[PDB]
Amino acid sequence: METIAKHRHARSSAQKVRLVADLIRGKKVSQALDILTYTNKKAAVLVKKVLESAIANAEHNDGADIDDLKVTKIFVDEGPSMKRIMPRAKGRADRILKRTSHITVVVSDR
Amino acid sequence: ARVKRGVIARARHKKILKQAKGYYGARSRVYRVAFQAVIKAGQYAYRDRRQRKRQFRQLWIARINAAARQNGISYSKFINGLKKASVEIDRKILADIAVFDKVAFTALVEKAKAALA
Amino acid sequence: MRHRKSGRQLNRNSSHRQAMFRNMAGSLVRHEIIKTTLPKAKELRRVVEPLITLAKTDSVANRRLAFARTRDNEIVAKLFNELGPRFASRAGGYTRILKCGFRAGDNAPMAYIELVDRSE
Amino acid sequence: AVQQNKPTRSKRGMRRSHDALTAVTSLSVDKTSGEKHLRHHITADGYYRGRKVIAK
RNA sequence: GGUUAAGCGACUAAGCGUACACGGUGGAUGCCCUGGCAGUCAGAGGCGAUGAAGGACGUGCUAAUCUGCGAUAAGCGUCGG
RNA sequence: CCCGGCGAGGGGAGUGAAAAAGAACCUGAAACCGUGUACGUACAAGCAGUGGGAGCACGCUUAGGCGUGUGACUGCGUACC
RNA sequence: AGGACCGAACCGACUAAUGUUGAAAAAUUAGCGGAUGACUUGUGGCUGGGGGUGAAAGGCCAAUCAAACCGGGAGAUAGCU
RNA sequence: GUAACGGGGCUAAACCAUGCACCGAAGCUGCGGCAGCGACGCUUAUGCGUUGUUGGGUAGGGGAGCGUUCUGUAAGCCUGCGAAGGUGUGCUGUGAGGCAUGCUGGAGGUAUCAGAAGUGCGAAUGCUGACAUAAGUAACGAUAAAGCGGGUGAAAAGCCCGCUCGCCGGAAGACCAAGGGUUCCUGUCCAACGUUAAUCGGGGCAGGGUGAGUCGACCCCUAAGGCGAGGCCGAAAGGCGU
């Protein structure tokens, strides 16, 4: 059972969301839920929404009994970057990379 | 007639990368840097194809010296005795015999001593 | 080095800090409860509690000083009228701080500071 | 005030190794409401040490 | 079998390196083009004060662009296909 | 239909030869970023490779090595135009 | 009356500090000189490149001036890298 | 920083004479494999029962070859029981390369011999697009300053209202002139922007809003100056001017 769930084009950066993902990597659904709820990060809620989507998918589109479910594979990946021009001193122009990341959560009973 | 060289360039780059596969860092990822490794690797292989003979000769000489000194004779004296006895055996087989069968090496040493004296 | 010194700065000058403490104490004693960051409540205890300590007693000069502090006629009227007798039997610890998590805007330690009252 | 050569991903990962957070691992269950909350913090509903503290 | 001593000695990976499988940014290679470049065969080489080229503003049931048109305004009349 | 914030996106259902053909849409590689697997690494110094090289993890006929990954240690070894 | 005196707006930048991938491609704080006259300013024009203007420094002529910018000779030439 | 045997260290492991042994190179020898040069016994557009020798190489000169686009071969052949590209593997040739296949792909490719190159990239402080590095670091753009309460909202320090604290007030207030062109108001949303969030905005969509005989422009006259019927001058252009 895969029961995959992802949130593409997320505003949060992959480098900053991998830190939150590692905390819940390989932990039980309830433990991950509470850790994300009480984590002091925007990425915490960003990935808690994905975890809720995944568990709802498991409940409805797949087998019930979410109690014996574990987050087996979770990984954060970068997404398309938007180019923005920010004026600087001496007339110099630099480019600001509005980075977006793809987050995928896979939950399986075994 | 415009000719696109992308396929040929990619083929050559893949050949170089597969030759350089297994290296550390960018040496196995960047073609521009991996190309230096394969040339240096080839030079090292060319040097080692000659260095291996002399290194194995060194190791065999060390083993024969050890065995001869254990038996009670020096390597130079043992070789001189073999030459005087007209024995064409080489260091590789001598070292194999010394490592595996002690009685054979004892026979070699005693015959060499008899020839010398 | 700050060896044994007391008094937070709160990234504010003396005038701004004293005005902030005055306003916060006035609001706290007016509403019997407020929400503020934990350091703010910790530093506001040392300001609010002496207000109640002073209000314990009643006199013309005491009223004038209680007005000079907190600069609010309505607040001083509430003091000496309801804040006095309701704590005449309590010696210290007139305020209670309950941590309530972190603010969403900037993730600052939030805590509710209130009097030990409201048992209606 | 500038790098002579580009550092490698190995050194980058070694530096970032210490940037990982640590889970609270201190979820406390209320005696009365039986709700999870941060230690020495009031619950979301407003219950702390069994008795209510927020009245809202 | 136990007490003591000496010697030897794996099992750890916060992270990192190699090879494999799976992912992502990325538009390179492959194929197609009503799109361009150069010629041959022929016409013509001008448009215009009975108001030229090029434009502004309007023109549909439709808020906007393209295209055609001008208050007769995505158009009107005669004769043919 | 469900999660989600009457969003975005995703998961189910259906269309479709194909949906890792879903409009950020033909074929979809590289630099770059992660996950899991096997190995090595926290007393060991330098173009990070080559020759030797024990051990470990995967399949084979035979029961010994052979095919691949890793590779402690060791002699040599100061990138390219 | 003063090409007067001290001193606001206004004009300019003499000193110090910060700012040199700055708030700014010469800026900000305090001091600083003029502030009724050779003062300044709003508007509208005139003087166009070996030429204009210049209380004259080789200064300014649209952030570029010991000869501006734009297009052409022009893919000037380079015994040089 | 010992630093004038390489170090350890050596009273012979220091120096002179002699001898016998060994290590010691890609040097020679033994074997196998490849290519050029001259000969003779023979094959005669080529093998050699052969023989001797050569094979380090920059600039440079000579010869022989591999790869791709297209054209004739070619309306022939492979190809939807799978072409080209992509991606790993096993063989094969002194080599540029060649062959077959695991998976993606989806409809083009092309044997042998010839003909032409826009025919082979690793650099030129090279050009175009993307991604790392520094680095999750500086910074988040005058040191006039926010707090509490209620409301909406999923989320409130910044969105709406009330009380406090602070700043300009010859302005940090109100009108205009020049300059912008709907940014002005309402409803509606957080796709993108605000150097963070935002329910908010000078952001996205829709709608509404600009009323002049007395305001200004328009219009009469005109200064500096422009154009200029005729006219003067100048190769033309054109310059002056009534």
Mapping DSSP to helix (H, G, I), strand (E, B) and coil, where does residue A44 land?
Answer: helix
SS (H, E, C) chain B: CCCCCHHHHHHHHHHHHHHHCCCCHHHHCCHHHHHHHHHHHHHHHHHHHHHHHHHHHHHHHHHHHHHHHHHCCCHHHHHHHHHHCCCCCCHHHHHHHHHHCHHHHHHHHHHHHHHHC
Q: Which amino acid belongs to residue A43?
A: A
CA distances to A33, C9, C29, D19 from A42, in Å: 14, 29, 35, 16
Whether A33 contacts chain D with CB within 8 A:
no
Tokens matching residue D14: 């070694």
> Which nucleotide is the nearest neighbour of D1, by CA and C1'?
H134
Inter-axis angle of helices B91-100 and B31-71, nearest 10 = 60
Cβ of C99 within 8 Å of Cβ of D53? The answer is no
DSSP C16-31: HHHHHHHHHHHHHHHH
**Of C32, C50, C6, C60, the residue nearest C118 (C-alpha):** C32
Closest chain C residue to the Cα of D46, Cα to Cα: C100
In this structure, are residues B57 and B65 in contact, taking their beta carbons and an 8 Å threshold? no
Closest chain A residue to the Cα of D36, Cα to Cα: A34
CATH of residue C41's domain is 3.90.1030.10
Chain breaks of chain D after residues with C–N above 2.5 Å: none
In this structure, are residues A55 and A69 in contact, taking their beta carbons and an 8 Å threshold? yes
The answer to whether some atom of strand E lies closer than 7 Å to the beta carbon of B16 is no
In this structure, are residues A17 and A10 in contact, taking their beta carbons and an 8 Å threshold? yes
Instruction: Enumerate the residues of chain C whose CB falls inside 8 A of the CB of residue D55.
Output: 118
From the centroid of its chain, how far is CA A33?
A: 13
Helix (H) or strand (E) holding D44: none
In this structure, are residues D47 and D35 in contact, taking their beta carbons and an 8 Å threshold? yes
Q: Which amino acid belongs to residue A69?
A: L
Q: Are strands D36-37 and D28-29 parallel, antiparallel or unpaired?
A: antiparallel
CA distances to A104, B36, B66, B112, D50 from A56, in Å: 15, 54, 75, 88, 32
The answer to whether some atom of strand E lies closer than 7 Å to the beta carbon of B2 is no
A90 conformational bin, left if phi > 0, alpha if psi -120 to 50, beta if neither: left
Delimit the domains of chain D by residue range. 1-56
Spatial separation of the C-alpha atoms in residues A3 and A98, rounded to whole Å: 30
Spatial separation of the C-alpha atoms in residues C95 and C25, rounded to whole Å: 11
List, in sequence order, the alpha helices (H) in A11-101: 14-24, 29-37, 42-61
Q: HSE on the CB side for B18, CA within 13 Å?
A: 6
Q: HSE on the CB side for B81, CA within 13 Å?
A: 18
CB atoms within 10 A of CB C96: 15
Inter-axis angle of helices C60-68 and C38-55, nearest 10 = 160
From the centroid of its chain, how far is CA C80?
A: 16
- Known binding residue A90? Answer is yes
Residue C7 lies in a domain: no
Fold of A1-110: Ribosomal Protein L22; Chain A (3.90.470)
Q: Which of the other chains make 3 or more beta carbon contacts under 8 angstroms with chain C?
A: D
Chains B and C contact (Cβ–Cβ under 8 Å for 3 or more pairs): no
Residue C99 distance to chain D (closest CA, Å): 5
Residues 3-42 of D with CB under 8 A from B: 8, 10
Resolution stated for this PDB structure, in Å: 3.0
The answer to whether some atom of strand F lies closer than 7 Å to the beta carbon of A1 is no
Instruction: Enumerate the residues of chain D whose CB falls inside 8 A of the CB of residue C32.
Output: none
Phi/psi of residue C111, nearest 5 degrees: -160, 145
CB atoms within 10 A of CB C39: 13
Q: Are strands C33-37 and A82-87 parallel, antiparallel or unpaired?
A: unpaired
Q: What is the DSSP letter of D36?
A: E
Taking the CA of residue B6 and the C1' sugar atom of nucleotide E33, their distance in angstroms comes to 22
Place of tokens 């609270």: D24
List, in sequence order, the alpha helices (H) in C32-93: 38-55, 60-68, 73-78
Spatial separation of the C-alpha atoms in residues B104 and C77, rounded to whole Å: 118
CB atoms within 10 A of CB D45: 13
In terms of C-beta distances under 8 Å and separation of at least 24 residues, what long-range contacts does A13-16 make, across chains too? A13/A78, A13/A99, A13/A100, A13/A101, A14/A76, A14/A77, A14/A78, A14/A79, A14/A99, A14/A101, A14/A102, A16/A41, A16/A43
Helix (H) or strand (E) holding C100: strand C95-102
CB atoms within 10 A of CB A107: 24
| Number of DSSP helices (H) and strands (E) in chain A, helices first | 3, 5
Q: Which nucleotides of F are covered by protein (CB under 7 A)?
A: 1-5, 7-12, 24, 30-36, 47-52, 69-71, 75-77, 79-80
Delimit the domains of chain B by residue range. 1-117
Residue D51 distance to chain A (closest CA, Å): 22
Phi/psi of residue A94, nearest 5 degrees: -115, 165
Q: Cβ neighbours of residue C97 under 8 Å, at least 6 residues apart?
A: C38, C41, C42, C45, C111, C112, C113
Domain count, chain C: 1
What is the residue range of C42's domain?
13-115
Whether B29 contacts chain D with CB within 8 A:
no
Phi/psi of residue C113, nearest 5 degrees: -110, 125
This structure was determined by cryo-EM
D40 conformational bin, left if phi > 0, alpha if psi -120 to 50, beta if neither: left
Taking the CA of residue A73 and the C1' sugar atom of nucleotide E21, their distance in angstroms comes to 14
From the centroid of its chain, how far is CA C48?
A: 3
Whether A39 contacts chain D with CB within 8 A:
yes
Spatial separation of the C-alpha atoms in residues D2 and A74, rounded to whole Å: 37
Q: Which of the other chains make 3 or more beta carbon contacts under 8 angstroms with chain A?
A: D
Residue C67 lies in a domain: yes
Spatial separation of the C-alpha atoms in residues A25 and A59, rounded to whole Å: 21
Place of tokens 């004026």: A87
List, in sequence order, the alpha helices (H) in D1-56: 9-16
Delimit the domains of chain A by residue range. 1-110
Residue D16 distance to chain A (closest CA, Å): 10
The answer to whether some atom of strand E lies closer than 7 Å to the beta carbon of B1 is no
In this structure, are residues A63 and A1 in contact, taking their beta carbons and an 8 Å threshold? yes
In this structure, are residues A11 and A100 in contact, taking their beta carbons and an 8 Å threshold? yes
Cβ of D10 within 8 Å of Cβ of B25? The answer is yes
Q: What is the DSSP letter of D7?
A: P
Instruction: Enumerate the residues of chain A whose CB falls inside 8 A of the CB of residue D20.
Output: 19, 22
